[PDB]
Amino acid sequence: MKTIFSGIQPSGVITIGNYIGALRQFVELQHEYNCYFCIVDQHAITVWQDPHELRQNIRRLAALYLAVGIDPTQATLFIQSEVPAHAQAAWMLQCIVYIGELERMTQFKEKSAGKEAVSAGLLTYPPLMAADILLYNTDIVPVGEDQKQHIELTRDLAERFNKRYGELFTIPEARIPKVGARIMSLVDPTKKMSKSDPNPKAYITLLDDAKTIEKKIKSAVTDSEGTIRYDKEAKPGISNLLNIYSTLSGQSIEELERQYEGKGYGVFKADLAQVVIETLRPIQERYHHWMESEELDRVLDEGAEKANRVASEMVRKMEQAMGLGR
Amino acid sequence: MKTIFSGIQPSGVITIGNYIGALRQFVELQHEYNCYFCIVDQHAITVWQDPHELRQNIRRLAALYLAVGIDPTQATLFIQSEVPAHAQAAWMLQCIVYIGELERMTQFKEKSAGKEAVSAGLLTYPPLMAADILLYNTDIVPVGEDQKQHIELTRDLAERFNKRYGELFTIPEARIPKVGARIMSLVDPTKKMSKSDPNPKAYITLLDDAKTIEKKIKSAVTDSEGTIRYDKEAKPGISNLLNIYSTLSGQSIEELERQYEGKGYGVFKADLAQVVIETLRPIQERYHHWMESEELDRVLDEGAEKANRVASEMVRKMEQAMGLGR
Numbered sequence A, B: 001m002k003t004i005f006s007g008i009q010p011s012g013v014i015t016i017g018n019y020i021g022a023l024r025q026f027v028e029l030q031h032e033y034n035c036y037f038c039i040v041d042q043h044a045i046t047v048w049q050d051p052h053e054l055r056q057n058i059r060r061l062a063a064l065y066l067a068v069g070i071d072p073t074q075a076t077l078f079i080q081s082e083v084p085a086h087a088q089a090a091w092m093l094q095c096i097v098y099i100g101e102l103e104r105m106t107q108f109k110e111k112s113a114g115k116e117a118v119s120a121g122l123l124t125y126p127p128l129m130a131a132d133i134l135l136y137n138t139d140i141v142p143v144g145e146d147q148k149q150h151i152e153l154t155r156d157l158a159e160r161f162n163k164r165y166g167e168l169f170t171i172p173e174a175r176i177p178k179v180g181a182r183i184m185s186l187v188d189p190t191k192k193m194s195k196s197d198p199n200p201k202a203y204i205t206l207l208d209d210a211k212t213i214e215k216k217i218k219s220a221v222t223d224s225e226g227t228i229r230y231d232k233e234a235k236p237g238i239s240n241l242l243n244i245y246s247t248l249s250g251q252s253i254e255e256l257e258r259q260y261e262g263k264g265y266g267v268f269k270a271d272l273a274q275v276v277i278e279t280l281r282p283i284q285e286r287y288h289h290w291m292e293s294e295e296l297d298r299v300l301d302e303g304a305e306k307a308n309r310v311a312s313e314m315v316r317k318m319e320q321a322m323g324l325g326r
């Protein structure tokens, strides 16, 4: 089947936004495509990290992924640093990307108007991200609009290597999520929901306890028109909710609209709060099981093991081409 | 015993000056210290290379180091890329070095007044060479006057890492060469003897056939005085010759002068042409034996293997502190 590569930043907290937005679709797609979910712990190292925290967020995230329903028999789920071929392909690639490309990388604005105290890893992580992808011949990479630009580079590098040394890499393609379900903030209906929002009430975490979920939805921003009707502009808040509610409950917006035909936001919120709680419960359970179970490690081991197998071979062929070793 | 790291750039050609200057004394040192001779092929890929040429120059250099007398049992001789820890620790160091530090590197001027068509390799190799070293808890890095600047940075990286994550690395020290002589060009006695020279007549390669060694020592510049006497200034060419001669024949300069008392350059050169031919003959022999012998690979194998045993335990502790993996 085709292959799909997904790099997951280790952050131990994914919003109901990631879930609706992409996570969910994978639980299904994982039986059709060949999927690799790499906990890129080497990329997370370019910025300060607290050793313990990082070590912890890598478990939390793997645990989570399995809970949501990723099938370790069906797909490969590994930590990035446990497959050395990654760091090796990173260097080989660092050698064919010209320095200009990295600087003209629309993200290096982190230069801080002359801060100059940035970790070189910050200017150099693209070659590594290119490695990550090219190593498994991935055909598709599910990236957001914000990323596209990086997938552009790896497309380039790949083509550059392929031409200089011979067809070896598959030129990937940046695919997006199923469109329509763009989950906005709870406190600001125009802003996208993200872990990185400074207001905790703008997002709900898969591990938010009932009470928290209830409190946050209650605070969700609405309008004063008081009618449950979909309106991208004019009625943003209500429309965001309607999307969340729908995607999770499985009802159409129209259905939800009519069903709340003569009611107001008070009851609507209370009903939504519940369908959310009802949707996370099994996840928070399974997650906790996964976290304390020794089975996690085993799944991570057989994951690396499955990854490494492919990587090793890819690296081996690269060295052959480049002309390294023996 | 103290450890000594020495990275050998694969080039398949080392000059009689390099042999005299450093190499020759290594066969001695190799008993008083713990030596690691790394054929650094990952660094050699920062600039265009022909794969076949590179694969070849890697064997050549190894065949030659043993030919010259390096004891694979006493010291460790390995290719850089056959020990993954290098490439791995490279990435971790890149994550703790500031961009400024890399740019202010007195050598990055290769950026050619706005060239930008330079591999990221040129800018980022330091973190790798820092790893090359640090990974072996080395004490002395035998460098040139010019290399010193790089040792400084790696010494820094060492400390930074030690203070942030704990005493783990050994701060290395950059020792200078033995020599007390220095070998000049054969075509220009003011220049230094080197493989990078555009005129072949300027140096003698440990693998130059006798007919060539003859033809190159003939051409060597002398003065017009016609006397074989040492004079740094005034008689540069003759002094250089006299230098090459002495070191290889164990005869003092005072002696050689007295010896050639009333003779001219004609004979002297012819004599010199011989002492060199004789000195290199066994070397070309041994070298050739190694080149067609499978024992060569077995030696590189047990080399990598001996090295990897130390490198891995270093990367393990490294990842441990950084908080990577499990």
Ligand SMILES: Nc1ncnc2c1ncn2[C@@H]1O[C@H](COP(=O)(O)OP(=O)(O)OP(=O)(O)O)[C@@H](O)[C@H]1O
Pocket: A009, A014, A015, A017, A018, A019, A020, A021, A022, A023, A142, A143, A144, A177, A181, A182, A183, A184, A192, A193, A194, A195, A196, A197
């Ligand atoms: N609010 C959202 N609405 C729709 N899709 C989302 C949303 N948040 C994340 N996603 C999707 O989920 C996947 C991304 O997650 P990540 O978790 O890396 O996203 P971010 O939005 O980039 O980060 P964060 O969630 O930490 O703010 C992406 O492929 C993206 O398309």
Ligand SMILES: Nc1ncnc2c1ncn2[C@@H]1O[C@H](COP(=O)(O)OP(=O)(O)OP(=O)(O)O)[C@@H](O)[C@H]1O
Pocket: B014, B015, B017, B018, B019, B020, B021, B022, B023, B142, B143, B144, B177, B179, B182, B183, B184, B192, B193, B194, B195, B196, B197
């Ligand atoms: N002419 C020389 N005189 C003394 N020592 C030399 C000479 N050439 C090389 N060496 C020794 O070899 C080591 C250096 O490098 P290299 O092998 O880099 O030199 P080259 O042979 O001059 O090559 P290149 O200049 O192309 O880098 C030095 O640290 C030095 O000890």
